[PDB]
Design a protein around this ligand. Structure first.
Ligand SMILES: *[C@@H]1O[C@H](CO)[C@@H](O[C@@H]2O[C@H](CO)[C@@H](O)[C@H](O)[C@H]2NC(C)=O)[C@H](O)[C@H]1NC(C)=O
Ligand SMILES: *[C@@H]1O[C@H](CO)[C@@H](O)[C@H](O)[C@H]1NC(C)=O
Ligand SMILES: *[C@@H]1O[C@H](CO)[C@@H](O)[C@H](O)[C@H]1NC(C)=O
Lengths: 49, 112, 126
């Protein structure tokens, strides 16, 4: 927004609405920033499901 | 990536002492930095370098008042007997593998 | 706008316990990682540590002798450095700075360069 300039994820387009909820979980994020080091290295993030 | 950190403002009566300072990361303490005088409504005019040892050099058209230094992982720079013509914006810049980076700005509300 | 204010001054001995605060206002705290700043009398800046948007820290830069510690209260929109042992050299004003690295950034990464410093709090100790 221009007046706030704040960025908020208060958007929902992957899902239209919510319903029938079973589980909720709040924790440390899975993807990791880890950025701050310099050079040409890239953030390769690997996952196993 | 890069931290090229600059003071948004520093205030004192006519006679203060900088010529603005830049902060670097732990991994690249020893790389040299440079700045560009983007004074308001004017384009970038190249004045303001720094090597990691603090050896000073003079630009064109401004007095010898200006100095420099170095300590630890950060980079420190100085003037003696501040004058009026230092109203400007500055831009830290170091060198990487084929990249000009150009850092970020120092829009400075120094009260002169 | 962007503005930062601080609190938590106090005259104590080395080894003491106080609460240093950098109240962050004018922007969303939930996504902005933050820093802390020391300015010894007539001496230059020495940064200590930071807490990222998630809550991780790094107590490097070797001016700290394993002395300063940091934390986060992300919900109340204030940034805290969890402090103990305020010592003699820490007579300083603490202009704390907002990184410009909101966690949604594109283009060349000159992010988290500090575009604004805090109002400052003077903590005289000797
Ligand atoms: C400023 O922020 C407020 C909330 O902090 C925004 O409010 C809602 O924003 C959503 C997203 O665009 C809109 O769909 C709603 O209509 C807004 N509601 C209200 C009551 O404002 C607001 O849009 C933001 N606006 C600006 C100009 O920054
Ligand atoms: C899910 O919610 C709907 C409400 O529209 C309900 O009819 C249905 O029985 C619910 N199913 C489960 C498994 O909870
Ligand atoms: C301070 O200003 C002078 C002006 O010419 C500039 O040459 C110098 O590089 C600056 N200081 C340092 C440490 O570079």
């Amino acid at each position: 927004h221009k007046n706030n300039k704040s960025w908020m994820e208060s958007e929902f387009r992957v899902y239209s609405s919510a319903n029938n909820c079973t589980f909720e979980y709040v924790s440390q994020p899975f993807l990791m920033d880890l950025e701050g080091k310099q050079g040409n290295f890239k953030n390769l993030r690997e996952f196993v499901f | 990536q890069l931290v090229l950190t600059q003071s948004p403002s520093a205030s004192a009566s006519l006679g203060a002492s900088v010529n603005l300072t830049c902060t670097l990361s732990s991994g690249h303490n020893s790389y040299a930095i440079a700045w560009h005088q983007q004074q308001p409504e004017k384009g970038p005019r190249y004045l303001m370098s720094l090597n990691s040892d603090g050896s000073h050099t003079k630009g064109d058209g401004i007095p010898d008042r200006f100095s420099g230094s170095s300590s630890g992982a950060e980079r420190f720079l100085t003037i003696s007997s501040l004058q009026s013509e230092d109203e400007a914006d500055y831009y830290c810049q170091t060198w990487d593998t084929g990249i000009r980076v150009f850092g970020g700005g120092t829009r400075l509300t120094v009260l002169g | 706008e962007v503005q930062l204010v601080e609190s938590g001054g106090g005259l104590v001995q080395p080894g003491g316990s106080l609460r240093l605060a950098c109240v962050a206002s004018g922007f969303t705290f939930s996504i902005y990682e933050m820093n802390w700043v020391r300015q010894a009398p007539g001496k230059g800046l020495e940064w200590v540590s930071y807490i990222t948007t998630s809550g991780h820290a790094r107590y490097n830069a070797d001016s700290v002798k394993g002395r300063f510690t940091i934390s986060r209260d992300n919900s109340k929109n204030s940034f805290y450095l969890q402090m103990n042992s305020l010592r003699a050299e820490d007579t300083a004003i603490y202009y704390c700075a907002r990184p410009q690295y909101h966690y949604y950034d594109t283009s060349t990464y000159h992010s988290y360069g500090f575009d604004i410093w805090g109002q400052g709090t003077m903590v005289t100790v000797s």
